[PDB]
Structures are given as structure tokens and as C-alpha cells.
Amino acid sequence: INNSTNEGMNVKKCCKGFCIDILKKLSRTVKFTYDLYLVTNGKHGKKVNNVWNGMIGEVVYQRAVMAVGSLTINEERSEVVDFSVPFVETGISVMVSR
Amino acid sequence: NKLHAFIWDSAVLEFEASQKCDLVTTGELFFRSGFGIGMRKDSPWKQNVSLSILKSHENGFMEDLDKTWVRYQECDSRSNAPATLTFENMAGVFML
Amino acid sequence: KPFKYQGLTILVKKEIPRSTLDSFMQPFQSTLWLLVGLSVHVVAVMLYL
Amino acid sequence: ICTGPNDTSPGSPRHTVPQCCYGFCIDLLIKLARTMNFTYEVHLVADGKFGTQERVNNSNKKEWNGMMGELLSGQADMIVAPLTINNERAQYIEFSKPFKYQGLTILVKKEIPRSTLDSFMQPFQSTLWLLVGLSVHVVAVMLYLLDRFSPFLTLSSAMWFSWGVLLNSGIGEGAPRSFSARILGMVWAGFAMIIVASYTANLAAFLVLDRPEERITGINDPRLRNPSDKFIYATVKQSSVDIYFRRQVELSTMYRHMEKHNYESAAEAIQAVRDNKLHAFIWDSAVLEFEASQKCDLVTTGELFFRSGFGIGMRKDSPWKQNVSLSILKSHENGFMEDLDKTWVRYQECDSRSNAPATLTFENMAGVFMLVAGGIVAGIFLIFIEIAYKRH
Amino acid sequence: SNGTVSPSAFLEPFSASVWVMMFVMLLIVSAIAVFVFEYFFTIGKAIWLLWGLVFNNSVPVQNPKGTTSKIMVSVWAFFAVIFLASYTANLAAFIQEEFVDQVTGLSDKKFQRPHDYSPPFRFGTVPNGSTERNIRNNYPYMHQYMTRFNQRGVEDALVSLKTGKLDAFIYDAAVLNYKAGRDEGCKLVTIGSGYIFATTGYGIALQKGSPWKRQIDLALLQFVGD
Amino acid sequence: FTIGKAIWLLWGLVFNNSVPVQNPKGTTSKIMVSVWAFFAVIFLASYTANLAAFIQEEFVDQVTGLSDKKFQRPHDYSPPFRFGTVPN
Amino acid sequence: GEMEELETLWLTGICHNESSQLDIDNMAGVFYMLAAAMALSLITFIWEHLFYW
Ligand SMILES: CC(C)CCC[C@@H](C)[C@H]1CC[C@H]2[C@@H]3CC=C4C[C@@H](OC(=O)CCC(=O)O)CC[C@]4(C)[C@H]3CC[C@]12C
Ligand SMILES: CC(C)CCC[C@@H](C)[C@H]1CC[C@H]2[C@@H]3CC=C4C[C@@H](OC(=O)CCC(=O)O)CC[C@]4(C)[C@H]3CC[C@]12C
Ligand SMILES: CC(C)CCC[C@@H](C)[C@H]1CC[C@H]2[C@@H]3CC=C4C[C@@H](OC(=O)CCC(=O)O)CC[C@]4(C)[C@H]3CC[C@]12C
Ligand SMILES: Cc1nc2nc(C3CC3)nn2c(O)c1NS(=O)(=O)c1ccc(C2CCCCC2)cc1
Ligand SMILES: Cc1nc2nc(C3CC3)nn2c(O)c1NS(=O)(=O)c1ccc(C2CCCCC2)cc1
Ligand SMILES: CCCCCCCCCCCC
Ligand SMILES: CCCCCCCCCCCC
């Protein structure tokens, strides 16, 4: 609600996109049910003070079975959690003004 | 010229096109996938091999392998600029 | 995990262009060349006339 | 004689005044009343809306507006108008076979190209023009310096040689005689040829400044995919195209943009496009193409999408359905729809549509004419200046 | 068709008014100015020199002696460079092959009265079809002439067109469009750049009063809309 | 009509800018000059045809890659290289 | 191939599918050649003076 309070509300928004289309096709093919929810614990996933936060942090601590999103397959993350086969190719790259 | 077109992996075809001046790829890579070190379904090396592949990807080992095996070039002749006139293209005027 | 990401593609012949000796005379057909060659002389001689 | 509202502006007293209607649909209606023995009386819609399912404020009830509200409520028995055929309309009323096949398209400004007086000097920047102008004189005077001071060509002669080498004119009857001067002058000739070729290469493009801002590809344009504040495009509120954009699975992102700019009538949107208040107007192919043919400053975009047809809608339980459909089909088979298209749609005033390169006219190239006039007016004073110099 | 190029194709780079002002209005004034500047070398020689500068082919000319006349000649040669650049820039596109359709439409005199031609027009359609019924209903004489050249099928008509035994093939618009698209070399094209006369549609026939008709119509409209 | 004047004439015909030249008097020399002028027309046409594309703006990347000296040792530059990523 | 369809639907952009004035730097080579001409003309002029002397 505000920075003064330490609690909030679960606002039901609508998630759609590339990862959501992947998730929907996965749901149809594997015949399972899903409950998406955004993560506010960490920015993207990181081990600080030997504690994982973010998407990986939620997965490792059994708070969620899956982590669908722009999550990069790494060495430490694959050591901590189990990844699926990559569906898009990424990597560290440099963008500059023309 | 016995075969007009050959459909194959991007890596091998691009390497051959770089090495062979008379062969050229076509573009718009389709069926994007990757080469994997396949093992049996019940194996003890699955996690370790996958982790080693990932670690080699993170540091500069796959880049080194690409540089030393795939990313060396002999003849490319690939540019969007108009062709430069040479001996063969313009010689009838010389004979004239 | 993949150690090399790639895709399917098509390899074909480079097909280096073929250049002939008459390439410079190609834009005009032989009949047009003969017509202009005749026209030059016709204009010249009857200019003289 | 059609009895329709007088003032279409909202918040105005709308009294049904008898005006007179005529055109493609009226001709088709007269043909129908001739072939099928029935009498008709035409009256315009209460509002300017074609018809769309809307949720009324009280009790949240589905309701039809415009033509569908007029017809389904019993006020009207038939709709002879450009009524597109689609599910929402066909679920409640029934359409005859289409009397005109058409699609959705985009009307935009023609954007005639703007030509300036300096269009001929555009290819070279002002700094390049100054540099070449200085270089001509530098080469001329140093040619004179190396020719006069030769071990073994007046200033006017050297200047004329440089100027006539730069622009091919033959004003130089004198060539350098010293070896260094010959070498410099001839490489200067090569330089002048290079400058002339470089300036000529793109001169035509700069003479007529055609831009790709006009001739949008269409809805497939990523400009249309992602709306922006600067680029505003719209359509007619509560119409078939509005329903098509609402119901389409993926174009909702731009439907949200269009919902806040929709116009009350097609004529208003066309006028807004004409005076550049609206960048693009999405509407039926027939109307937009007719307007583009009639109006020289408006043009369509292409790749017709949502291909459908105009149907003469009637109530679901009607006795004229089969007869009207058969009459429409029979008029299609013989040369009646062709005659209507020729007499109402297929006449042209200005097209100016061709893939050939544009032909130069007065507006595109007049800076060169004014440059020649300026040369005239400059020589008119330079002759007196030279006479005064000769006096001394 | 093999096509043709209009004789005016080389005069397309400039409009008629531009040509007129360039060569009879501005050139005459420039010649008057050149001669006046030189006299302060007849007018014919000044006109000849200026015209030679228009398209510099190294034609023999006599340059004026005066300095101001030389300046005017120089600026005029700059104008001539502009003219040559603008004319030659798009000459390749304007001098290009133009394909003209043999017949404007079904109402063309070739279809209606083919007898008044030294080569008889060879056109026809496959039998037992909607197109034959339509042409028979609309044009009886044209149908009676055209049934002589009656084809056997789509492929027979296409090969007759390719060989030359048939010049025109009147058939369904969708099928002909598909054949033109599939055709290699783009040798067969539909007249009018996609001109359709009967402009009907493909429908799913049903028994009279069939209960499925409404649902099929609704589903087809859903497919169209989506 | 020395050799220098012949070279000057032929060169001037190569790119005809109406440079002052002294044409040869012999008929065969005139025929040779004519065929060379045809060659010069060929040369000018072929050179000017694609001059617009060759004289065109070329965009060069600032850095070859992550192993470029700008990234590794940015201090040895008068303008320090400004690069970074989001944290976490 | 559903992956390809999703990639075109979600990741395609403006510059993926993809006449200017000429500056001094655009045509600097021609001016370099002219400068070389000036230098060579001066050099050969000095050479001719030396030969004459
Ligand atoms: C210096 C004097 C002689 C005036 C300059 C000559 C041109 C101005 C005249 C002479 C011949 C004229 C042309 C001769 C005849 C043609 C065809 C003529 O009819 C057609 O276009 C035929 C089209 C077709 O058959 O497909 C149109 C004019 C035009 C281009 C003329 C255009 C103007 C021309 C070139
Ligand atoms: C005595 C001195 C001033 C020379 C006179 C030149 C005129 C006799 C020639 C030169 C250019 C000729 C013009 C050049 C081209 C134009 C366009 C041309 O219009 C077209 O589009 C081509 C013909 C066609 O499309 O049918 C008509 C002739 C015309 C006026 C020509 C008319 C006669 C012109 C003016
Ligand atoms: C015989 C000696 C004294 C040399 C004489 C050479 C000159 C003929 C000058 C005239 C113009 C000079 C050019 C003018 C400026 C350009 C830009 C210059 O590029 C830049 O430094 C950035 C762009 C800019 O200068 O604005 C490169 C040199 C160059 C080709 C110059 C090269 C030398 C030029 C040709
Ligand atoms: C079909 C063909 N194949 C060729 N392969 C070659 C190559 C590379 C070795 N040349 N060449 C041809 O030139 C032709 N065409 S030709 O036989 O009709 C022909 C012959 C000669 C001339 C003269 C023209 C004036 C200048 C001197 C030559 C012109 C036309
Ligand atoms: C921005 C602009 N808008 C214009 N609208 C018009 C039109 C149609 C009426 N012209 N025009 C311009 O010409 C400019 N540009 S300018 O003011 O920097 C300018 C002025 C004058 C000259 C001379 C050049 C030598 C020949 C004589 C004119 C050159 C450049
Ligand atoms: C293309 C039209 C060319 C017309 C040329 C007319 C030349 C007239 C010369 C008069 C000399 C006295
Ligand atoms: C005696 C005359 C010699 C003329 C030499 C001209 C050399 C021109 C070189 C141009 C290079 C682009």
C-alpha cells in the first residue's frame, strides 16, 4: 500500500507475453494447472550472504515449483536449481549508440 | 553443381562457405537448436557434464574453440556494396 | 546443455558472374548498332550535301 | 425522399427534416422495389452509428445502436446501406448475399513533396561549396604562379581555364605550357570531374525530396503495431471495423489507442485526415478508394484486410430473405452491379498513382531557373563594372 | 504480350511546360543576354553555342570574347550540367518495357465481334460450369462463337495458352489467380490487373431448409473475422 | 604534335571536361582518337554508374568486443569509456 | 515451428528489417589527391629549375 507499512495486497493483474504463451502451450501439452505470481523479493536472482533471492530464491526455497521468465541459465543457478532446455538463445552483449 | 541446394546445420555450412570460395549460405536460420553431448537416460555424468559445458560457456573456452576451429576465414567476398570491376568483368573494351 | 547454438540453413553455389567480350556492346542489339552506324553516315553525307 | 435528422452535432435539437437521398444503395433499393413488387420509404438513422453491441447504463443490458437498433426494434424493416457482414450482426439479423465485396484499408495524406529554391545546391553542404569555390581560385592563381615563373596564360586565362574545367563549358582556349602547370591543371581536371560526378549522382533525389513517411505499409507496419502520441490514427466509432479490432485477439494494444480517438462519422474522419488532424483513418475499401480517387490529397495504403461484403440486412424472420438474396445474385450475374460501380464508384478525377519515377515540373525544379535569372541580373551589373574598370 | 514502348518515353523526364521554358523561353533570353553582353558573333552563333552547351558533345562552337558573356556562358553551362544530370538520372526507368493488355474486358470488341479481325481471337472455357452458363445467359452470339474453341480442362487451357493455340481463357477468378501465381516466368496474367466480372463467391451448398446452414454461416463468418 | 601533347589529349578525352587539346591532323590518328573516346565513354559510364553507392556513409563500431582495450583498460583514453550494467 | 511463430510475434522490431549530403570527410580522398597534385607540381617545378640551372 505504501512504504510506511510492511504489508501489501495481492492485486490480480493479467500476465501475457512470450513466456506466457510458452507457459500456456506447456499447460495444454502437459495438462497441468498454474498460478502465476510476480516476485518482489529480489531483482532477478542472486546469492547474497549465502541466501538466494528473486526468481531463483523463490524456486530453491520451495515457494514455487516453476520460474518462467527471462531467466538466464547459469553455472551457480544450475548448481542450485534444475533448469529446462533453453528455448531462446541469450548472452552478455554490448549495445552502443550508432 | 550436381546438387543445387544442401540443407544442413548452420555451423558446418557456414564453415564450408568461409573455407570454400565457390559455396555460399542462404540465410534466415530456421529450426534453431544446439549441439548436445548425448548420454544414456540413466547416467552418472549428466549433471557434471552439463555443468562443465555451462562453465566452459561462461568463461572464454567456447569462444577459444570457435576462434581456433570455426572462426578462421580464407575467402569471404560477402558485402552489400556493388561489385568492383576487375580484369574479367571489363576486358572486351581492352580488346576493343 | 548445448555447447554450440546453431540452426538449419541452405548451402548453394556461389555462381560467380560470367563476363563476355561483347559485354560492352550488349545494351544495344545488333540491329540498333547497325541502325545508328548507318544513321551517322547518312547525317554526315547529307550535311555535306 | 428520405426523412433524416437535420443537425448531426451532439447536444442539438434533431428534428426529422425531409431531404433527398441518391446513390449506389438507393439505386439498388429502387431495383429491388422494381423486381420485387413492394413499396418503400427511406429514412436516415436516428444517429450516425452503423451499429454495435453496447452495454446500456441501467441494468447493464446489451443493446444495439444505429441501424441495428432501428431494425431490431421494428422501426425499420430493411437496411440498404454499406452494412458489413460479421458474427455480431449476423447473430441477430440476417444478411443477403453481398452486393459489394470490399475490405478494410487505411487512408492517409498524399504528402505532396516540398521543393525549395536551394534544392539544386542541397547535395553539397555549404562548407563543401565554400571549399570547392576556394579551391578553384587557389588552383587558378597557383597555375599562373608556376606558369609565369617558368624557367622558359594571363590571370583571366588561368581563371577561365579552371572555371571551364570545373563546369564543362569550353571558356578556356588556353592550356598550361609549363610541365608543373600541366600536371597540376590536369589532375585538377580529374578532381573537377570527380566533384561533378559526385554532385550529379544524387542530384535527382535532392531535387524532389520524396520521403517514406507517406505510403505506410498498413496495419502490418510496426508503426501501427506500437502506437505513439505523435502518430494518431483512428476509425469510425461504433462500426464494423471497431468491432473487428475489439474482438481480434492480438490487435488490442492499438485498439486501446484507437478507442480514445474514434470519430462520430466517416466524413468527419476523412476531413480530419485531409487537414492533418488525423494521420490515418481505417475504413472500408470502397469508401476510402472512392475518396482517394476524388480527393487528390488523400491516398490509400493497400493490403486489404478483413475481406467481407456489404449486405442488405433484414430481420431473422422475414419473407424477403430468399427473394432479396436471389435478386442480388441475379444483378451480380448480369451487368447491373458493374453499371452501378461505373456510374457511382468507378469514375475518376485525379489519380497520380504510378510506380514510374516522378516527372520534373515547375515546383520541383525552379531554383535553377532563378539561378539563371540571378546570373542575368548579376551580369547586368558586371558589364557596367567591367566598363568602369576599362575606363581606368 | 511482347509489349511496346511509347515514342514519348524519352521525353518523360521533364513535363512539356518544363521543356518549353528550358528550350524556347529561357534559352532565347540567355542567347539575347549573351549577344548583348558580347556586343557591349551573331545571334545564331550564340544560340548554337548555348544549345551545344545544353548537351556538351564537343560540337564546334565559337566562344564569346567578352568577360561578362563568358560569365553568363559559365552559369548557363552549370544549368546545362543540372539539366543533363536530371534528364539522365531517370532515363533508364522511363525507357523501359511496358506491357499492355490485349483486351480491356469482356465488353471489348474482340470478345463481342471477333470476326472483324484478320487473326480470329481464340478464347473459351471448360464446359459444364458456372462461367459457361453466365456467358450463355449474357452473350448468346459470343457463346456460340466461343463454344467452338471449348477447352477440356484447366491444364489443357493453360498449355494451349502457352503454346499459342489459345489467346484468352475465361474461367473462375480464384482459380485463374492461383494459376497465375503458380506460373513460372509470369507469362500468363489476368487482364485488368485482377478484373472480376460476376464477382460471386464460393459457398458450401446445402439442402433446402437444412438446420446446419445457420451454424455454418456463423462459423464461416467467425473464421473471416478472426 | 609531340608525345606529351598526345598524352594530354588522350587523358583529356578520358574525362571530357572540354580541356584545351590539339587534335591530330592525320586521318588514322583521328580514328584512333575516336575509338579511344568510345573507350573513355565506356570508362566514364562504368565509373559514374556506381559512384553514388561507393561514396556512401559507413558506420564503424566503436568497440570490437568485450576483449577490446577500451573495456579492459579504459583509463588510457582522454574520454573515459562509459559502460555498465544493472546490478543483481 | 511454434517457437519461430512466437519469436516473430513478440521479438520483431523496427531496424531488423532494414540520399545524404556529402561532407568534407565524405569526399576527403579527392581533396587528398588534389593536395598530392599540388605537392607533385611544386616538386617537379623545382626539378625543372634544377635541370635548367
Ligand atoms: C527540332 C524539331 C524537329 C522539333 C523536335 C522534334 C520533337 C519535338 C517531335 C518530333 C517528333 C515528335 C514525336 C513523334 C511522334 C511521337 C508519337 C506520337 O504518338 C504515340 O505516342 C504512339 C503510341 C503507340 O503507338 O503506342 C506521339 C509524339 C511523339 C512522341 C512525338 C513526340 C514529339 C516529336 C519527337
Ligand atoms: C529555335 C530554338 C528556340 C529551338 C526551338 C526548340 C523547340 C523547337 C523543341 C525543343 C524542345 C521541343 C519540346 C520538347 C518536348 C516538348 C514535350 C512534349 O510533351 C510530351 O510529353 C511528349 C509528346 C507526347 O507525350 O505525346 C511536347 C514537345 C515539346 C513541347 C517540344 C516541343 C518543341 C521543342 C520545344
Ligand atoms: C601544397 C600544400 C600546402 C597542401 C595544400 C592542400 C590544399 C589543396 C587543401 C585544400 C583543402 C584542403 C582539405 C580541406 C580539408 C580537408 C578535411 C580534412 O578532414 C578533417 O580534418 C575533419 C573535417 C573538417 O575539416 O571539417 C582533411 C583535409 C582536407 C582533405 C584537406 C586537405 C588539404 C586541402 C585539400
Ligand atoms: C558467346 C561468347 N562467349 C565468350 N567467351 C569469351 C571469353 C573469355 C574468353 N568471350 N566470349 C564471347 O565474346 C562470346 N560472344 S561472340 O562469340 O558472339 C563475340 C566474339 C568476339 C567479339 C569481339 C567484339 C569486339 C572486341 C573483340 C571481340 C564479340 C562477340
Ligand atoms: C527554407 C526555404 N524555404 C523555401 N521556400 C521556397 C519557395 C517556393 C517559394 N523557397 N525556399 C527556400 O529557398 C528555403 N531555403 S533558404 O531561405 O536558406 C534560400 C533562399 C534563397 C536561395 C537562392 C539560391 C539561388 C537561387 C535563388 C534563391 C537559396 C536558399
Ligand atoms: C531536341 C530538339 C533540338 C532542337 C535544336 C534546334 C537548334 C537550332 C539551332 C539554330 C542555329 C542558328
Ligand atoms: C605531358 C602531360 C602529362 C599529363 C599527365 C596527367 C596525369 C593525370 C593523373 C590523374 C590521376 C587521377
Residue numbers in the entry:
A (entry chain B): 442 to 539
B (entry chain C): 724 to 819
C (entry chain C): 531 to 579
D (entry chain A): 435 to 586, 601 to 840
E (entry chain D): 540 to 579, 599 to 784
F (entry chain B): 599 to 686
G (entry chain B): 785 to 802, 808 to 842
From the paper:
Our study shows how increasing the tension of the GluN2A M3-D2 linker by deleting M653 (ΔMEM mutant), in combination with addition of lipids and a PAM to better mimic interactions between extracellular regions of the TMD and the lipid bilayer, conspires to fully stabilize glutamate- and glycine-bound GluN1/GluN2A receptors in an open conformation characterized by four bent M3 helices and proximity of the LBD layer to the TMD. We, therefore, used the nanodisc structure to describe the architecture of the open state. Notably, in the open-state conformation, the LBD layer is closer to the TMD and all four M3 helices of the two GluN1 and the two GluN2A subunits bend at the N5 position in the SYTANLAAF motif. In our open structure in lipid nanodiscs, we resolved several lipid or lipid-like densities near the outer leaflet of the membrane that are consistent with CHS molecules. A third density represents a molecule that is packed between each of the GluN1 M1 and GluN2A M4 helices, where it forms extensive interactions with GluN2A Y821. The location of these CHS molecules is consistent with mutagenesis and MD simulations of GluN2B-containing receptors (51), in which the four residues with the most notable effect on neurosteroid modulation were at positions equivalent to those in close proximity to the CHS molecules in our GluN2A-containing structure (W558, D815, Y822, and M823). Together, these observations suggest that CHS molecules may function in concert to stabilize the open conformation of the receptor.
Canonical N-methyl-d-aspartate receptors (NMDARs) are glutamate-gated glycine-dependent ion channels abundant in the central nervous system. Their activation results in excitatory currents that underlie synaptic plasticity, cognitive integration, and memory formation. By comparison with previously determined structures and together with our results from kinetic modeling of fully liganded receptors, we propose that the gating reaction of GluN1/GluN2A NMDARs involves at a minimum these three conformations, referred to here as: primed (closed-pore, all M3 helices straight), engaged (closed-pore, only GluN2 M3 helices bent), and open (open-pore, all four M3 helices bent).
